[PDB]
Scaffold this active site. Sequence first.
Site, short mmCIF file in Angstrom:
data_model
loop_
_atom_site.label_atom_id
_atom_site.label_comp_id
_atom_site.label_asym_id
_atom_site.label_seq_id
_atom_site.Cartn_x
_atom_site.Cartn_y
_atom_site.Cartn_z
N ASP A 85 0.80 -1.23 0.00
CA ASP A 85 0.00 0.00 0.00
C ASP A 85 0.84 1.28 0.00
O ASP A 85 2.01 1.27 0.37
CB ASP A 85 -0.96 0.01 1.19
CG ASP A 85 -0.29 -0.39 2.48
OD1 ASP A 85 0.73 -1.09 2.42
OD2 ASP A 85 -0.79 -0.02 3.55
N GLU A 155 0.05 -1.98 5.77
CA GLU A 155 0.99 -1.56 6.79
C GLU A 155 0.60 -0.20 7.30
O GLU A 155 0.78 0.11 8.46
CB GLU A 155 2.43 -1.54 6.27
CG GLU A 155 3.46 -1.06 7.29
CD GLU A 155 3.61 0.47 7.33
OE1 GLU A 155 3.48 1.12 6.28
OE2 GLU A 155 3.86 1.03 8.40
O1 LIG Z 1 7.95 4.07 6.51
C1 LIG Z 1 7.42 5.20 6.43
O2 LIG Z 1 8.13 6.23 6.29
C2 LIG Z 1 6.05 5.31 6.51
C3 LIG Z 1 5.45 6.55 6.44
C4 LIG Z 1 4.08 6.65 6.53
N1 LIG Z 1 3.52 7.86 6.45
O3 LIG Z 1 4.31 8.92 6.28
O4 LIG Z 1 2.23 7.98 6.64
C5 LIG Z 1 3.30 5.50 6.69
C6 LIG Z 1 3.90 4.25 6.76
C7 LIG Z 1 5.27 4.17 6.67
O5 LIG Z 1 5.94 2.98 6.73
MN LIG Z 2 6.16 2.18 5.16
#
Ligand SMILES: O=C(O)c1cc([N+](=O)[O-])ccc1O
Ligand SMILES: [Mn+2]
EC number: 3.5.99.8
Lengths: 422, 421
Positions: A85, A155
């Site tokens: 995702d 995730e």
């Molecule tokens: O791994 C990330 O940087 C990450 C960032 C977001 N986000 O900025 O919403 C969500 C899931 C993530 O793994």
């Molecule tokens: Mn991520």
Amino acid sequence: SNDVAKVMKTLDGMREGLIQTAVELGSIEAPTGREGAAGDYVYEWMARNGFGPERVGVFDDRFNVVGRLRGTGGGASLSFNSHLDTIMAREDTARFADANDRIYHEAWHEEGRIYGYSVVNCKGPMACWLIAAKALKEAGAALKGDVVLTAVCGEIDCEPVDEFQGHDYLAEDIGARYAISHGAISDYALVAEATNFKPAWVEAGKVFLKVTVFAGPSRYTPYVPRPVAALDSPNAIVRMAKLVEALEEWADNYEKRYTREYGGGTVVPKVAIGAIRGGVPYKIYRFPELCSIYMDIRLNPDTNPLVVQREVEAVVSKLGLKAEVKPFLFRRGYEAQGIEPLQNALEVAHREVVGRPTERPGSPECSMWRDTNPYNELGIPSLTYGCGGGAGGGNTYFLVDDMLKAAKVYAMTAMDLCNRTP
Amino acid sequence: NDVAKVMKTLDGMREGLIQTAVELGSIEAPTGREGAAGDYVYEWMARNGFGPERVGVFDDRFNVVGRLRGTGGGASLSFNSHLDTIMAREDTARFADANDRIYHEAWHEEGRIYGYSVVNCKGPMACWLIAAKALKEAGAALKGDVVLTAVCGEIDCEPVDEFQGHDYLAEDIGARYAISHGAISDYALVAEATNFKPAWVEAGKVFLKVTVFAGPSRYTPYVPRPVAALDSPNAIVRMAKLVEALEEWADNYEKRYTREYGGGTVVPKVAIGAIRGGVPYKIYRFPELCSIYMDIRLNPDTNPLVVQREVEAVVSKLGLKAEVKPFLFRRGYEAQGIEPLQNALEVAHREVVGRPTERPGSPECSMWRDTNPYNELGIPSLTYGCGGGAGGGNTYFLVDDMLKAAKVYAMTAMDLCNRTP
Ligand SMILES: O=C(O)c1cc([N+](=O)[O-])ccc1O
Ligand SMILES: [Mn+2]
Ligand SMILES: O=C(O)c1cc([N+](=O)[O-])ccc1O
Ligand SMILES: [Mn+2]
């Protein structure tokens, strides 16, 4: 010895495949809730390259994809994990000033960088270990143990609440933890997301609070009492506005009070107000008797969610407000136990490819939710490691050279670790 | 004190207790179709002003969560029971008489209530639902909240192979989902059938699909005979030999991995729960493959991969080609920091039952119950109820015992929910 060198040369020749795979994958529309198409790509990619994938999911259009590179026998298993995702949907004009910005949805190779949020998070690191696995196989590297290739959905921290339920709004409950609980187990696991080549093996939990402030009695606009003190307002929106500044100061102090250092990183747990509503926009002639706020509160591994709830109940109590503080999400964060074999295998690879010892991870990358938590929760010692700055940052690109470096580190890590006897 | 008042209230709720268990137990609700039971409990909770919410992954399979809200400043206690039952009328493949009565209905005879649906688990559920009502009607003083949690999918059904999604899910959409999405508290009492004996360790589990390979496939008029079993081209024949080897391994497994904890003794057992190969409607060629499906319970300290290797080794010792693939893994736990609830319950128990608690039978410590998700998520949790376990299989409760349980539940709550967190 040189069975490393053999693979490294192979990967050097796969640079063009590394790019295309990242771009083709990043180009697919796959925000949380519609990762189906992205999964299909990954399934068929694994299929073509003979990793014998299975679809493992709760819904038929939202699933995890798990394949393996099987070993000769008698070795430790290593999982590689990234998620299908992406953050932005073209739909969500309520969160972004320009919901339809090219950088939010597409992915392209300019320069020698690959741009796109979809690539930073996470298609991206995923391309890196997919290619890495391909190298190991085609170079015929000797591996006693299995390499597990796990591409997961959900995730990202979307969660259901109130009337927003079921298939469309679920994420983590049907993601990694589901895949692992239903077969994708291994001795150790590397979650490939963007750190800056800095390994982290602590991560934060989180509790989500819905804070609903009550007021009233409802009055038709020509009858509203004025002037009245803000905290005494019959308009719940007015009272909430006062609660918001109190909560913001509480949050300023929270992250400092609950900062905590672990071997796997320093956890700086932050707080944000992510949504507000009350009442409905299409019936505004009577102000609301209630108004809700929705809080993202990150936890260090050692904080009980109920403790945080009482702290918030107390902020409200200090203002003399009547409110409901209701939790609607709770997940635990973990620091890995027994991480040294993966930690060491990676460290060795990192110094070979990158050149210096690894550094301690940046706090935001330790203080989030990544899928190291489900693995750790279930006894599979697990860390996170990849190239570039986090998308939460927000970084918007990868250097192609760094992606290649990572894929090399992933492969090398596997060749060490998968030849140990458990 | 304020206790005697509650006890007397409960003495008077005897017929409501019976009616509630029977009406509840009477509903068809095998795992996969617990919807109607969810609907009943919601409406029961609604009627008594416990403000219930539906928390689920599907709109026809959900958990029901309500509260009895406290004055403020006490510890929270959850009460938990599950909405699904074991036997479906469909299941002619597991039971000799799938359409008995004890499997599907529930009725008041002696001073007993009969029905597997009542033992497991509508009844222990009835016991604390009534207890909450008593507490609420007697206006008992409680500083902390009491959380009322009726969950779906507790029973160990799991998807595998082609059986995926809505119909086959169980535990992933049950208690752990409910807890992860709001039904949290300081401590949790899972009300299932023990014999008034508390347990606070429980077992994990790994499910293995073992497929034996053979071949080449032959039309029956060409099948080679005689051939040694382990050399048969018929995978069914080879599997038959493996089954005996695995039964031998199973006999020793449970003894080797027996382990006593403070919370109870775990004796992890093994069963072959299903077999197939190939299909009944095309039998003119024996199968080149045949699968077995294994239920292997784990103690809290056993890595599932270790068990997989043991089984792969059993296969290897026979010279067979096989794939051993896990399709379920859940961890079992012993509660940490259970002492406050342990003490609260013990005191209640001695008051109502008259003697100290005894140590639980190993099978009630060596299964899957919803104490595991609570403990996994840092909510110290034990199990306690009346009567013998359905896995036993006990088929009735004495109403006198059900009443005793509700009293213990009520008192436990009055103690614990008035201690400071
Ligand atoms: O791994 C990330 O940087 C990450 C960032 C977001 N986000 O900025 O919403 C969500 C899931 C993530 O793994
Ligand atoms: Mn991520
Ligand atoms: O709690 C039980 O006793 C129990 C029994 C079975 N079973 O006998 O199949 C299944 C789930 C249970 O919780
Ligand atoms: Mn049960």
